[PDB]
Design a protein around this ligand. Sequence first.
Ligand SMILES: *[C@@H]1O[C@H](CO)[C@@H](O[C@@H]2O[C@H](CO)[C@@H](O)[C@H](O)[C@H]2NC(C)=O)[C@H](O)[C@H]1NC(C)=O
Ligand SMILES: *[C@@H]1O[C@H](CO)[C@@H](O)[C@H](O)[C@H]1NC(C)=O
Ligand SMILES: *[C@@H]1O[C@H](CO)[C@@H](O)[C@H](O)[C@H]1NC(C)=O
Ligand SMILES: *[C@@H]1O[C@H](CO)[C@@H](O)[C@H](O)[C@H]1NC(C)=O
Ligand SMILES: *[C@@H]1O[C@H](CO)[C@@H](O)[C@H](O)[C@H]1NC(C)=O
Ligand SMILES: *[C@@H]1O[C@H](CO)[C@@H](O)[C@H](O)[C@H]1NC(C)=O
Ligand SMILES: *[C@@H]1O[C@H](CO)[C@@H](O)[C@H](O)[C@H]1NC(C)=O
Ligand SMILES: *[C@@H]1O[C@H](CO)[C@@H](O)[C@H](O)[C@H]1NC(C)=O
Ligand SMILES: *[C@@H]1O[C@H](CO)[C@@H](O)[C@H](O)[C@H]1NC(C)=O
Lengths: 202, 202, 202, 202, 202
Amino acid sequence: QRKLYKELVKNYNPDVIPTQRDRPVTVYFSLSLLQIMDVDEKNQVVDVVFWLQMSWTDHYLQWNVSEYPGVKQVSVPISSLWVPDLAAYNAISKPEVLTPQLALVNSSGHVQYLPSIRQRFSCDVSGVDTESGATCKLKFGSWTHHSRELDLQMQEADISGYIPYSRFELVGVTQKRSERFYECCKEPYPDVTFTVTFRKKG
Amino acid sequence: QRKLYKELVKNYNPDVIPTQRDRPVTVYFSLSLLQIMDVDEKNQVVDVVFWLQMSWTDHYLQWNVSEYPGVKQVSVPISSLWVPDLAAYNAISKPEVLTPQLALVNSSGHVQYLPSIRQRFSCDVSGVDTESGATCKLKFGSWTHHSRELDLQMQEADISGYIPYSRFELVGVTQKRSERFYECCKEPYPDVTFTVTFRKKG
Amino acid sequence: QRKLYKELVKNYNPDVIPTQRDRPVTVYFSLSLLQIMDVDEKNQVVDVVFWLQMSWTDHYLQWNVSEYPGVKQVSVPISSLWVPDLAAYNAISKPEVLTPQLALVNSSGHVQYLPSIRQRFSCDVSGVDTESGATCKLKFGSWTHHSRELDLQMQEADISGYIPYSRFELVGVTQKRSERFYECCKEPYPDVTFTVTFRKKG
Amino acid sequence: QRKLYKELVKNYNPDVIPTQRDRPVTVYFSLSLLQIMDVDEKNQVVDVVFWLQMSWTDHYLQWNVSEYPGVKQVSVPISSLWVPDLAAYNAISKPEVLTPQLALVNSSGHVQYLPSIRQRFSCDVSGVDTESGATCKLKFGSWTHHSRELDLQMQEADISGYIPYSRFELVGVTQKRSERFYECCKEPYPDVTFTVTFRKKG
Amino acid sequence: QRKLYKELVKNYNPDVIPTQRDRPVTVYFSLSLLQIMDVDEKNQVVDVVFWLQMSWTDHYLQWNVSEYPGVKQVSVPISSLWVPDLAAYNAISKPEVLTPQLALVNSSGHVQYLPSIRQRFSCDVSGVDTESGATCKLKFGSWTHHSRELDLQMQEADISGYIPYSRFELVGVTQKRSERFYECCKEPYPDVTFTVTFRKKG
Ligand SMILES: *[C@@H]1O[C@H](CO)[C@@H](O[C@@H]2O[C@H](CO)[C@@H](O)[C@H](O)[C@H]2NC(C)=O)[C@H](O)[C@H]1NC(C)=O
Ligand SMILES: *[C@@H]1O[C@H](CO)[C@@H](O)[C@H](O)[C@H]1NC(C)=O
Ligand SMILES: *[C@@H]1O[C@H](CO)[C@@H](O)[C@H](O)[C@H]1NC(C)=O
Ligand SMILES: *[C@@H]1O[C@H](CO)[C@@H](O)[C@H](O)[C@H]1NC(C)=O
Ligand SMILES: *[C@@H]1O[C@H](CO)[C@@H](O)[C@H](O)[C@H]1NC(C)=O
Ligand SMILES: *[C@@H]1O[C@H](CO)[C@@H](O)[C@H](O)[C@H]1NC(C)=O
Ligand SMILES: *[C@@H]1O[C@H](CO)[C@@H](O)[C@H](O)[C@H]1NC(C)=O
Ligand SMILES: *[C@@H]1O[C@H](CO)[C@@H](O)[C@H](O)[C@H]1NC(C)=O
Ligand SMILES: *[C@@H]1O[C@H](CO)[C@@H](O)[C@H](O)[C@H]1NC(C)=O
């Protein structure tokens, strides 16, 4: 019934970005803030819990919807396939993934990974009591592949996920991707930056 | 003696949900509160310890009660078979499983997993001192499988397990499963939500 | 010299209890209190460090004292053989094993495992200042095997291991194994319960 | 298209330093301070988050730019190749690597590893309030390979990475490599030492 | 050039103590105090960071200095060879190894392991303010092997490694090995006990 798995992994090396030369693997990135845990005004850091949304197309993982019974989509362990090496640029703590590390794959080869993470970032929380509000920037981006290899494209930033209570309230979330040439390598480097603004409830 | 193990694992890939098409693996879910550890009124979080009761039928794991001596049920490591990818939609800390990660299996193929977990959840503990009491919702649910693949069915919520002493006392536990829709993915995702109400003893 | 190891592991699956049908593997259990670290009167929990003493007979692990030079007993990693799945039924934290995870095995097949553990238990430490003293019960027991598969038999509780200083002093340690029956299995269940009584030194 | 990976790992044992005899593997070391988290004046320790810049040449990892399509550089998991066993001599906590553990490799065989680390060091933070400033020395160095096997060569210390805000401000960063001697062995052990001086903003 | 590794591991099982019968593997043990982090007078525990010096002779790991080019000594991961199962008897926290887990081996077969560890011990720190000073005993010893299998021999205790500043100052370090005849089995158990005395600087 599911010899599909045996086949999908057969000739697969997850350390290889599935590019079809000059055809950069495009990954649709998106972050959804769930809650702001703490704010260390003393050391300038915020504890955040978010919901990463990543989707890309792995040509190595497609199959004939017919050659296999009624197998539309399968559930695979991220440790089995290639997954975007996105990293938090201003992080000061290792990311702690809260949810099961599993991804969904199409019969056509479309992967979807939605981990819930709690991670701490370096940020200026000076004006977290002022009505103006403290602003934190969460910069994400590939850690090794450039624009031609891995193309980052941000999608609709969902904010309806934020906790209703919570000691803090969201004043605004921006999100904007930028490509920077970096002094070297003819190839640019993309990155999505979520700008979160919040203030203590009073 | 027990060549049963060698056989049960022979052609098994634990990353594959044991469905036989138009036959969704039904898992009987149930949570039993053991004790409320702490309540962070400052950050709005509760530390809870409970033990989850999960049971399902794995057709790949059945055997002839005769072909094998007097082997009625075996004790296998969850890392060896498929196990429901249930997750706490609203958790803010990785689950810490306290008990041995072993499951029991019938000669017919009925698995049973009863782990004791300590995990922290985001919750509004404002009125934990009021006689009305603070209410927390623990939402659980499959993470990659929809209704047709994995059917969640809640069973009798046991409450006789709660610690007699404890700084807190249980005012009420509800528990109710709902089939909810999410953007994308044609199918809907079943989730069981345990609503716990407690107040500080005084 | 030691092809003994290559042979002892050859046809071994550590997930299989060494029962030779109608011959329940009997494990001699025993706990030795080393020190009481802390007592959280606010949340009702004790931090304990104890010395577990477990011994059983693995028929799969015996050899001819002659066929092998002068190899009387070997030192093997618990991850290599079957080991009792005993669990603390009243624990609120994963057990932290302090010592090397190695076991000793006889030429006849008698295993011995003595790990030092620090674990926290839920307990009523209300009267820890009273001269009467607070009493904690540490209930241990298999997690999946019943009486016919794994027979728990408690042996002499050693108390001479307790720390002379320490903020607390031992008023008494009981220890008593009990078997029961429940709704199911027609299968009984063994469990050893160490009852520790202590009070703050003043 | 990337059978390159299958080939690069084929005859590779990452526990073997890629010295091509009498030609010591030279690794270009460099640290970049990102932020000083806390200073424990009571126990004399600093919590630091730095950027580590390491680059070396692995002759075992080179390939014909032509024999392989347009594969210029690949992204490999440090657990797959040999990587400098540099250690922090005066660390009092295990290093916590924040970024993805991946390295970049040239078609010629030049590896590049840039991990972001948060680690705590033993240091005299007495005068952290004085205008003179507290000074900490972060001594790094290979731990098992001597001068002839692994040659450490420090490069330009980048300081533009430091956090603008932060409770502390950098008064000076030195950095100087020294070839020293030890009471364990008969051989020179090189080591780069970054001397950071900072004071609390007031 | 280094097929030496492929050969050194070929017929090796690291769970087997390398005793060439009637020849107890003698390990030269030695501890060097680096710094005393904290002292919990409330719970009677000290946080210590030391430097373990262990050396022994593994006959299975020797080679012809000629049969292999100019390979004098190699750097191997402790997970690859047998290493003394020494344990901290009165430890109340798992040992946290700070340095790279690698060992050095002679062409003759002499292993050397020098890990830096931070571990907490149960100790009477009552008089840490008195001029007399608090005294802590760090008892180490094999966990499964007795005198005939593993012979512990302490060597010069180096104290020049202690941190100059530090809230505490060393009043004295003794170190003395004792052979402790336990219950049964005529072969006793050797254990080295480092007695450290310190007082708060004032
Ligand atoms: C995808 O699978 C279908 C069904 O197996 C393949 O169809 C074959 O060709 C025609 C069109 O359906 C049928 O008459 C044959 O009977 C099918 N052959 C088989 C093996 O049943 C189709 O060719 C496949 N296409 C791809 C992309 O591989
Ligand atoms: C899955 O593949 C389908 C093609 O059938 C495509 O419409 C979609 O973009 C992919 N994602 C889904 C529907 O989850
Ligand atoms: C099932 O058990 C029967 C009991 O009579 C026995 O003959 C045989 O081993 C098994 N038969 C099949 C087809 O599974
Ligand atoms: C186990 O198998 C038996 C076989 O008759 C079945 O009746 C029962 O519902 C299954 N569940 C358990 C764990 O008892
Ligand atoms: C034990 O080993 C000896 C070899 O000295 C052999 O003669 C004898 O048959 C063996 N007996 C058993 C119990 O296997
Ligand atoms: C081996 O088991 C026998 C059981 O009779 C016992 O006498 C002997 O002391 C044991 N050896 C050990 C565990 O040291
Ligand atoms: C690389 O491969 C080409 C194949 O066209 C071959 O001609 C050439 O000798 C190789 N170049 C080097 C650097 O050896
Ligand atoms: C690899 O790095 C070296 C460093 O000098 C550089 O010269 C070379 O161009 C890089 N790779 C190749 C062969 O292009
Ligand atoms: C050592 O190596 C030499 C030359 O390879 C050869 O005589 C023999 O293999 C070895 N002899 C001894 C005594 O180790």
